[PDB]
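Try it yourself: sequence plus chloride ion, in.
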Amino acid sequence: ESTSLWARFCEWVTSTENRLYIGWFGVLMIPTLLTATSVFIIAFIAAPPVDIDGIREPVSGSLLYGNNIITGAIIPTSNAIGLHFYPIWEAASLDEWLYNGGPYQLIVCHFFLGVCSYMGREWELSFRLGMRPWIAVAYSAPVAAATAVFIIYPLGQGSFSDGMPLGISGTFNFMIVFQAEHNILMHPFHMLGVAGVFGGSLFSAMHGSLVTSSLIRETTENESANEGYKFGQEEETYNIVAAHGYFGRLIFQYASFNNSRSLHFFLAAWPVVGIWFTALGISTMAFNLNGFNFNQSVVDSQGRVINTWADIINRANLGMEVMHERNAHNFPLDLA
Amino acid sequence: LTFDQLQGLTYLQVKGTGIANTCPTLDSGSSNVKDLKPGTYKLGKFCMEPTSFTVKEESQFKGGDAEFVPTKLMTRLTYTLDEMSGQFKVDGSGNVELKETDGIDYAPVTVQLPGGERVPFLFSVKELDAKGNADGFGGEFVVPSYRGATFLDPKGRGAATGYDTAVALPAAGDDEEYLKENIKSAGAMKGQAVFSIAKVDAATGEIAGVFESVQPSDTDLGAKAPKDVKITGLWYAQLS
Amino acid sequence: LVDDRLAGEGTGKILGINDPSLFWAITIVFTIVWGVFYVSTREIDAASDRENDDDFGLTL
Amino acid sequence: MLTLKIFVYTVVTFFVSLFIFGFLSNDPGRNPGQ
Amino acid sequence: IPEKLAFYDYIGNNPAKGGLFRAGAMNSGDGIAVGWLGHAVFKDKQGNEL
Amino acid sequence: MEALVYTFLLVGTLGIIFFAIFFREPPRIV
Amino acid sequence: MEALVYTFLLVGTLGIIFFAIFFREPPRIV
Amino acid sequence: XXXXXXXXXXXXXXXXXXXXXXXXXMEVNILGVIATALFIIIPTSFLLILYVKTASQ
Amino acid sequence: XXXXXXXXXXXXXXXXXXXXXXXXXMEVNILGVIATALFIIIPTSFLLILYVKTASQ
Amino acid sequence: GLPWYRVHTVVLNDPGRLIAVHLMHTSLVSGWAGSMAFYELAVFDPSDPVL
Amino acid sequence: AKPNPNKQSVELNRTSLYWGLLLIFVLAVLFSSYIFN
Ligand code: CLA
Ligand code: CLA
Ligand code: CLA
Ligand SMILES: CCCCCCCCCCCCCCCC(=O)OC[C@H](CO[C@@H]1O[C@H](CS(=O)(=O)O)[C@@H](O)[C@H](O)[C@H]1O)OC(=O)CCCCCCCCCCCCCCC
Ligand SMILES: CCCCCCCCCCCCCCCC(=O)OC[C@H](CO[C@@H]1O[C@H](CS(=O)(=O)O)[C@@H](O)[C@H](O)[C@H]1O)OC(=O)CCCCCCCCCCCCCCC
Ligand SMILES: CCCCCCCCCCCCCCCC(=O)OC[C@H](COP(=O)(O)OC[C@@H](O)CO)OC(=O)CCCCCCCCCCCCCCC
Ligand code: OEX
Ligand SMILES: [Cl-]
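Structure, out:
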């Protein structure tokens, strides 16, 4: 029916017959994520060492430069750059761009646009399929966490060098330095984050085990129980009342969800809310609102400080603080 | 930009432009240092902006004709020495003696050779004492160690601070294989710089010209042999 | 100096336009996309089966 | 590098323009309900 | 002092000093023991033993 | 040689991902 | 290493002979 | 000639290069190549045997 | 004095034994192990895939 | 069924899948050339062209 | 679209498996000494 080029293009873009839905957020998601993917793979394999701390001490993060999969990483941008925009065209040579940690900014900037567009693309397909539009809201929790460690934390700290390195061992260095400077473990938001993932892991195991325990017999013992379910079934494949009866006796009757809709909202809310707060926690600690500091909180009658477990944590925090970025500090306070 | 032109610009009009890394140009003036009254002047605003970095490489093609190959700058516009002060003595016969005292007088620079080899060096004119005529007056200067005595290597080993062994290897540490790396030294070296006067403004007490400097590279606290770096560029100063 | 660079970093230029050619790159592309969109609005609205009067658009 | 900058400005503007005029093309009407 | 007895007093023969992926024999880690170097007694300048 | 193994393992995993998406068993209604 | 790989190849070849004789496909008339 | 033999080593380096500045890493187990190859092929073959058997019926 | 001659003084052999009584540790390319392994497993898997498919009819 | 040495004979009379099969060998040959060059560039030492 | 009419099914009887396994192992035994060299 449509004869105009744009009318035909817009029909193809929003077409739900494509193998992978594109949509209008996809014309932003696909080019940005492919750009970040291409440079990430190339940089993870063959990028030269990067002077991350701005002290002319390059750090090797590539496979072809002596790293394995665990220790390989895309090194963050140089501390000399700071938060300044460093596209490849602002560098005199591509060798200089690689030396100063250019690929990190290219990945992070295009990746942030990709996940934001991926979130919108999740809404768009739901609208095209006529379903309720809040899977994207649940996806905002991991997006916030990714945005916090790649954008907001570098923003508050003043440098992209303080972002999370794009690597496995680089991630661990990010966490350890983060504990030493902010005491993230004592922050109530990582506490909520831990309850979000420990609880989410618990609820996933319980919901999965309770549904599996209640499968209605539809197969023999020489076949997988999965065969008892046919894709497109109009009837239920497990007995919800039986599962509620088991969990009702397990703790007590009113500690169990009799409602599948309430149960599944709880399965979604608990991890999403938990990840929202731990994402906020990193964002708040980006502006140096650190976790609880109970050092020397307990003192005896004469004033002698009685140590607690918090003070032992401070001893570990002290060790990381005096060792991270060994040659980078000329002055006693780590204000940056 | 002359010195007066630069002073007529706000910091926000310079920040990011890159002209902050340029020595002032001396226009008009004269080409004869004789216009300078003989005496001992006070060197001020002395600045040396490089125009080229070349590093000598041993020739694998035999012949021993080690030549200065071209390089690519790696650390951006952070390589001009400025605010350098001292004394400048002018002789009636045209003899010139320059002596630097304070100021930046040093800047870490890294360049990359063909093949992907980053060669760092500490471009410096520290304790520069040059004597000669107006057309060419050269002298030697102190090139301090690229890394200070308290610089810790990725294994925590340093000169004045750090481990003296490979702690990662409790048994094979302190072996003959690692003796060179375990022991670190921060001794300095020396370089030769030849200056030349091209423009001299007697009225404003400003001089300018070109220079050529040859100095060793970073030795990695004594872990590697230094290469030879030739730095050619412009220079400017204000006698007062 | 030793090398050449755009030297536009941290200079507060409108839309990052260091040279006027970038303006033509953005303007020409936007005009083209706007051009093909403009001559297709009627066809797109016709699919709605309603006329884009003061009562057109998703409304609850 | 300017050639690279102009190419990227052309490319980024192209995909952003499609995004902008894509949602201006009676997007809300593209739904399976009535 | 028997050299066998002294060899037991070496932390390299401790089974809690290895690694999960430091594969092979203990000889592959710190070498093959050749001989005892004798007990090392450290003395201060004034003669006190450290 | 380890770099060869690491790169082969990584691109091998991405190869499986590509095939799992496009060369999958289509979900057919009953 | 070579001596271990030579022995496995040889005993591996002998193992195939054993299966080819006793665990063979039986020849059946029509 | 041993003087000239060591003259080249201290001078311009020898051939065959290495990935990046240095990637020899001779400490690498090398047996890990066989371990990685055997851990890939043996289970992969097991899975492919079952799938092809299944896909053909 | 220095124990540099101590390990030298160990003229009596002290090392894990070689496979031969006359010592068998010769320079063979360890790539032979991988090449032999790949040449065995890859075609063996190919044959087993085809046979198990056929045997299942 | 088909003997193992006659499997690739299925595209004998299928012009569309013959092109696909010849496009696959071309993909592998081109992929080898790029892989071979990258491997050689990781090993080649250009320091001493004469000797 | 319609299914491809050129579909065939590969076959390998047990005696072919033994021949194939014998060739691979015998050829490996032959060339292993040279590959190690
Ligand atoms: C309870 C069983 C057991 C135990 C306690 C040992 C113990 C020992 N063995 Mg041994 N061995 C065993 C079973 C066992 N073996 C079996 C079943 C075999 C036949 C394969 C062998 C064959 C064997 C050989 C050929 C050798 C030994 C050797 C040794 C000694 C060195 C240990 C070592 O470095 O291992 C190291 C263990 C690891 C590096 C990793 C452990 C496994 C991890 C934790 C499991 C992870 C899953 C898996 C690895 C994932 C694969 C990923 C893929 C990329 C590979 C040691 C005392 C060596 C020796 O000292 O010679 C005298 C020697 O060369 N063993
Ligand atoms: C471009 C060259 C070419 C092409 C397109 C073909 C195509 C074909 N040949 Mg053929 N052939 C060729 C060259 C070629 N051949 C040469 C040079 C020889 C002499 C050795 C033969 C000898 C030959 C015989 C005896 C037979 C065929 C058969 C066939 C048909 C089925 C093949 C099959 O399914 O087996 C598939 C093979 C396998 C599944 C495994 C075998 C692969 C070999 C043994 C090793 C693999 C090498 C490596 C992986 C790839 C690199 C090779 C490259 C360097 C050249 C098919 C249409 C068969 C036929 O006629 O059908 C009725 C048959 O009986 N060919
Ligand atoms: C735009 C396409 C293109 C281009 C520009 C190149 C360019 C190049 N290729 Mg490549 N290649 C391509 C496509 C391309 N290739 C494709 C599609 C494949 C997959 C088949 C390959 C596979 C490939 C391999 C395996 C190799 C290269 C290699 C090379 C490099 C050297 C080529 C050479 O000198 O060999 C010379 C080329 C020939 C001698 C071709 C001769 C053609 C014969 C003689 C034709 C005779 C019959 C003919 C029909 C005559 C009848 C008609 C007549 C009467 C007029 C070179 C940079 C080599 C390399 O260095 O690796 C990086 C290498 O080995 N390529
Ligand atoms: C050490 C191991 C190597 C690691 C390599 C990692 C990368 C590749 C991983 C592949 C893993 C997946 C295997 C199973 C796939 C499967 O079942 O496909 C499903 C289809 C179904 O059959 C086809 O199906 C079609 C439709 S459908 O798929 O059935 O819907 C139908 O039309 C057609 O008739 C029928 O034949 O199978 C195929 O025909 C696919 C082609 C055969 C598989 C080839 C895989 C190897 C490719 C080479 C990779 C190495 C070199 C790459 C160079 C660029
Ligand atoms: C010699 C010692 C071992 C050396 C191993 C060396 C490796 C190479 C040789 C083995 C691999 C090749 C064999 C292929 C088998 C085949 O095609 O026929 C399939 C056979 C035929 O029997 C089936 O038996 C059927 C009866 S029933 O259906 O099972 O009742 C009947 O129909 C018919 O006989 C047949 O179909 O099926 C089997 O039941 C055989 C069992 C599976 C094969 C075992 C392989 C591993 C052997 C042991 C390995 C460890 C050795 C150390 C021992 C301590
Ligand atoms: C990517 C690389 C990996 C792919 C490799 C794939 C391997 C290709 C398959 C090759 C092996 C299978 C072919 C043989 C299996 C086989 O016999 O197939 C059977 C075939 C004839 O049988 P049919 O045609 O009746 O059946 C074929 C089957 O497909 C159906 O069952 O014979 C041949 O094809 C020629 C082989 C004769 C003998 C081959 C080698 C003989 C040498 C024996 C050496 C040992 C003794 C030496 C003493 C000196
Ligand atoms: O850059 Mn990365 O880590 Ca944030 O704290 Mn200050 O700065 Mn540096 O030190 Mn600590
Ligand atoms: Cl650190």
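One thing you can check immediately is this: The CA atoms of residues 19 and 25 of chain K lie 10 Å apart.
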